[PDB]
Design an enzyme around this catalytic site. Structure first.
Site, mmCIF file in Angstrom:
data_model
loop_
_atom_site.group_PDB
_atom_site.id
_atom_site.type_symbol
_atom_site.label_atom_id
_atom_site.label_comp_id
_atom_site.label_asym_id
_atom_site.label_seq_id
_atom_site.Cartn_x
_atom_site.Cartn_y
_atom_site.Cartn_z
ATOM 1 N N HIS A 1 0.761 -1.213 0.022
ATOM 2 C CA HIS A 1 0.003 -0.128 0.009
ATOM 3 C C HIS A 1 0.754 1.292 -0.099
ATOM 4 O O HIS A 1 0.212 2.327 0.024
ATOM 5 C CB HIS A 1 -0.951 0.014 1.138
ATOM 6 C CG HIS A 1 -1.355 -1.319 1.617
ATOM 7 N ND1 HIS A 1 -2.023 -2.186 0.797
ATOM 8 C CD2 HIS A 1 -1.411 -1.901 2.856
ATOM 9 C CE1 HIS A 1 -2.425 -3.444 1.402
ATOM 10 N NE2 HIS A 1 -2.079 -3.205 2.630
ATOM 11 N N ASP B 1 1.051 -11.539 0.487
ATOM 12 C CA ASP B 1 2.438 -10.594 0.682
ATOM 13 C C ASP B 1 3.766 -11.611 0.435
ATOM 14 O O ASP B 1 4.654 -11.624 1.546
ATOM 15 C CB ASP B 1 2.010 -9.937 1.841
ATOM 16 C CG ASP B 1 3.104 -8.706 2.019
ATOM 17 O OD1 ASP B 1 3.508 -8.282 0.756
ATOM 18 O OD2 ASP B 1 3.417 -8.178 2.835
ATOM 19 N N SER C 1 1.938 0.989 8.759
ATOM 20 C CA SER C 1 1.764 -0.103 7.930
ATOM 21 C C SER C 1 3.303 -0.938 8.147
ATOM 22 O O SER C 1 4.160 -0.336 7.632
ATOM 23 C CB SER C 1 1.348 -0.033 6.742
ATOM 24 O OG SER C 1 1.488 -1.223 5.914
#
EC number: 3.4.21.90
Lengths: 151, 52, 151
Positions: free
Chosen positions: C28, C50, C102
């Site tokens: 992101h 991921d 994040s």
């Protein structure tokens, strides 16, 4: 003094020394000099003497003074100890002489560089250095022992 | 020349979806290398053998 | 611990963590890792599971270890505080829930990483986190609560 390292893939594998007028970097190593004032210098190939272009700007010329002939056997300093021999370097003991070290100046008691270390990882009981040297009347030679693997 | 176009398009599309199936075989299991691996998903459905 | 952030024009907007045998980076955010050894690695894109590539060698590998099985709902440590939840993620108070957090790892009491956060800015009085984890037998899954913005 001044000796900026050369880093390939982040880690350090060699060092580039600056003699008065010309910067000397070994080409058996590979990478990029981390200095922005030195990475803009052109790279000029040579023999195993490993020349590079002396495009050093006039603001910070003459970093170190080289040493000519009339060289006694004497006692000469070194970054991890001392070397006391003229025709070759001293057979330094084990431990010192690892990897990622080639390119160190070898200075006198006055700080005049007399050699640049390239090879000689292991030479039996004690390891013998493979350096570049100036001969009896100031011409650069390369001195190696038999079966000396490079750094 | 029309018949070889069908046999070329459908060849590189069926192995395209098979390559996606090959890729999605592994990313559940390459993320956790400590996890054990079944013998059905090792050689039959996918290609990866036991390693490390 | 070792968790290098991600730079983009100076400001901090992402975090990259190092596990045993691999490196991670969320999708992101866009930017370059300031570490030179962590910038030449071929980070390959993937799905929500991921998958990244830990192509760095062994000599700095495994700063932390990923969590084993037998996960209780007990105490888990966090950079801003603590969390006590296994099925979902705990209702942490405000302060945490900003922007650019994040990729910060969630660790247990024994310094072992359990989950990596990717979203869940603010869900009212109770704030949830969209993380990845291993569900029952080590298969890496992605958990997202309802209305989880990319954080």
């Amino acid at each position: 003094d001044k000796t900026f390292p050369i880093m390939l893939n982040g880690q350090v594998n060699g060092y580039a020394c600056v003699v008065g007028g010309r910067v000397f970097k070994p080409l058996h190593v590979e990478g990029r000099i981390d200095n922005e004032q030195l990475a803009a210098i052109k790279l000029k190939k040579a023999s195993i003497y490993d020349l590079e272009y002396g495009d050093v700007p006039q603001c910070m010329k003459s970093d170190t003074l080289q040493y000519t002939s009339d060289k006694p056997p004497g006692f000469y300093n070194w970054h991890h100890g001392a070397v006391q021999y003229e025709n070759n370097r001293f057979t330094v003991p084990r431990g010192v002489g690892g990897k990622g070290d080639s390119g160190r100046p070898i200075l006198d008691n006055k700080g005049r560089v007399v050699a640049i270390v390239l090879g000689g990882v292991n030479e039996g009981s004690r390891t013998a250095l493979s350096v570049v040297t100036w001969n009896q009347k100031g011409v650069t030679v390369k001195d190696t022992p038999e079966g000396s693997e490079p750094w | 020349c029309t018949c070889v176009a069908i046999i070329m398009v459908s060849c590189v599309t069926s192995v395209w979806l098979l390559c996606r199936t090959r890729n999605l075989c592994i990313t559940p299991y390459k993320l956790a290398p400590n996890a054990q691996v079944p013998i059905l998903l090792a050689l039959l459905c996918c290609i990866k053998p036991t390693r490390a």
